Amino acid sequence: SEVRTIKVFTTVDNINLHTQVVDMSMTYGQQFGPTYLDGADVTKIKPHNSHEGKTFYVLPNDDTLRVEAFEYYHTTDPSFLGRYMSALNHTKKWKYPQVNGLTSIKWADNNCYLATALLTLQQIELKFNPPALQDAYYRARAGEAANFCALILAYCNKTVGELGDVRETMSYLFQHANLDSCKRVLNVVCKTCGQQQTTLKGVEAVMYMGTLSYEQFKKGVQIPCTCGKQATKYLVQQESPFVMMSAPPAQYELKHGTFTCASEYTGNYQCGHYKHITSKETLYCIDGALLTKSSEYKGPITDVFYKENSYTTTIK
Numbered sequence: 001s002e003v004r005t006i007k008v009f010t011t012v013d014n015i016n017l018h019t020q021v022v023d024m025s026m027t028y029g030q031q032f033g034p035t036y037l038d039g040a041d042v043t044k045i046k047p048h049n050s051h052e053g054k055t056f057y058v059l060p061n062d063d064t065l066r067v068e069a070f071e072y073y074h075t076t077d078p079s080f081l082g083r084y085m086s087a088l089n090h091t092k093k094w095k096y097p098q099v100n101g102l103t104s105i106k107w108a109d110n111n112c113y114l115a116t117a118l119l120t121l122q123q124i125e126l127k128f129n130p131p132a133l134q135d136a137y138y139r140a141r142a143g144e145a146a147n148f149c150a151l152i153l154a155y156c157n158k159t160v161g162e163l164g165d166v167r168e169t170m171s172y173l174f175q176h177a178n179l180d181s182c183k184r185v186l187n188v189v190c191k192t193c194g195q196q197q198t199t200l201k202g203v204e205a206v207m208y209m210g211t212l213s214y215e216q217f218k219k220g221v222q223i224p225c226t227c228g229k230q231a232t233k234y235l236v237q238q239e240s241p242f243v244m245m246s247a248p249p250a251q252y253e254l255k256h257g258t259f260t261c262a263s264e265y266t267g268n269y270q271c272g273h274y275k276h277i278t279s280k281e282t283l284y285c286i287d288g289a290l291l292t293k294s295s296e297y298k299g300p301i302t303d304v305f306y307k308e309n310s311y312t313t314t315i316k
């Protein structure tokens with residue numbers, strides 16, 4: 001038979017493109033290893049004339065790509081590149097409407113927790129350590145959210161169609177954000193035991209589970225103690241751009257102006273539906289691509305986010 005070839009671009013960051021020549025006789029997988037075009041596996045697909053000049057994602061098999069990859073993704077896990085493409089292949093087919101001047105996702109493949117988290121990430125000051133996340137986030141804010149949503153799944157070890165905890169997802173995204181400066185000082189007072197001051201840095205400094213009221217946390221909350229008597233934990237000092245207050249879903253009333261945004265969760269554990277309530281001039285319930293407006297909001301709320309700079313307690 002006759003030998004035909006085409007010119008294609010190979011890359012791992014879609015930033016450093018390496019020109020390559022492909023034998024139309026052979027498949028992409030035989031000569032490049034796992035290969036993906038727009039997140040679609042082409043490892044067992046022979047090249048087409050239309051493919052010439054197009055960009056193709058490949059697995060790092062030489063040291064140039066090993067580096068370029070780690071520098072972009074900040075991970076050296078081999079499976080990560082495949083999972084990002086696997087995901088992206090689906091997330092490029094979602095619809096991302098501007099809802100209340102924020103990018104959102106039309107409900108599909110249980111994307112409700114992702115929509116919420118994304119609507120959330122557009123309202124708080126997050127500086128992303130991996131370029132991949134930065135580049136995608138910016139392109140998300142503009143409305144092309146496919147790549148972002150796809151990196152979130154990849155970094156959270158989740159697959160399209162599977163429902164996720166909004167809090168477990170933010171925990172993960174904060175692992176990959178610059179929150180080193182953030183500081184939290186907690187005093188815990190037990191009448192028998194005495195006092196104990198705790199300082200938390202990074203992700204632990206902006207996430208609390210067991211109370212949704214930033215107000216109640218400052219006042220102090222009841223927690224069990226070693227001696228069996230109850231103890232009071234209150235916020236001494238918060239140095240962060242925001243704080244995340246989480247609790248198991250329960251009836252809560254968000255008043256306009258007291259919070260930045262909230263995750264409402266209706267349904268049983270691991271099978272419920274998520275809505276995003278954002279506080280602006282009035283209250284805005286962003287539920288996938290749908291939108292309702294109230295002055296107040298009574299619903300089961302598991303996550304509430306508040307903006308912050310530096311807070312010092314006046315107690316004692």
Ligand SMILES: Cc1ccc(NC2CNC2)cc1C(=O)N[C@H](C)c1cccc(-c2ccc(CN3CCCC3)s2)c1
Pocket residue numbers: 163164165166168248249250265266267268269270271272300302
């Ligand atoms: C959606 C989801 C996905 C995955 C996971 N996986 C584990 C976390 N890492 C692995 C968790 C959840 C979850 O469901 N979270 C909600 C907020 C949540 C988290 C914790 C507990 C609950 C509830 C227990 C009983 C409920 C019914 N309630 C709702 C209102 C009144 C009765 S909801 C709900």
Ligand SMILES: [Zn+2]
Pocket residue numbers: 190191192193194225226227228229231
């Ligand atoms: Zn005690």
